[PDB]
Design a protein around this ligand. Structure first.
Ligand code: THP
Ligand code: CA
Length: 129
């Protein structure tokens, strides 16, 4: 798995962001994770967490998996990194996302994220009440 460069265009919500990628604007969906919609409980907090993370970052990078790169709504499916810290893992670790939409074979990172969710659940963080 290899990382490519990308520039923040706009934060959107907990698990989507708009990025300039190979010269084109694109909406990106985070792999393996599901935040609440903004209208749901911990939605605003998820959006807020991802916004700060991508906005405060000097370098954002994107990482596709072995399977689907672009989902049926035209969104780039990626692990996203903010100064080398994975947003996907980070949300799960804070209990602001659930591990979700794990399809084979697009799940290189499942074990690391489930590792993070175990710890967040143990900790009763945010969505784990
Ligand atoms: C995360 C992810 C979502 N999706 C699609 C499944 C979709 O469900 P539907 O067919 O129910 O729309 C949608 C859900 O994402 P959102 O959580 O952004 O709505 O995104 C993928 O196809 N692959 C993925 O890896
Ligand atoms: Ca969602």
């Amino acid at each position: 798995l290899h990382k490519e460069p990308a520039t923040l265009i706009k934060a959107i919500d907990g698990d989507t962001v708009k990025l300039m990628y190979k010269g084109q604007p694109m909406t990106f969906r985070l792999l393996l994770v599901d935040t609440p919609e903004f209208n749901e409980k911990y939605g605003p907090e998820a959006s807020a967490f991802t916004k700060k993370m991508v906005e405060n970052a000097k370098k954002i990078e994107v990482e596709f998996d072995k399977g689907q790169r672009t989902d049926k709504y035209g969104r780039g499916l990626r692990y996203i990194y903010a100064d080398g810290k994975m947003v996907n893992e980070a949300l799960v670790r804070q209990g602001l996302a659930k591990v979700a939409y794990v399809y084979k074979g697009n799940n290189t990172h499942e074990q690391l994220l489930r590792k993070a969710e175990a710890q967040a659940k143990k900790e009763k963080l945010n969505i784990w009440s």
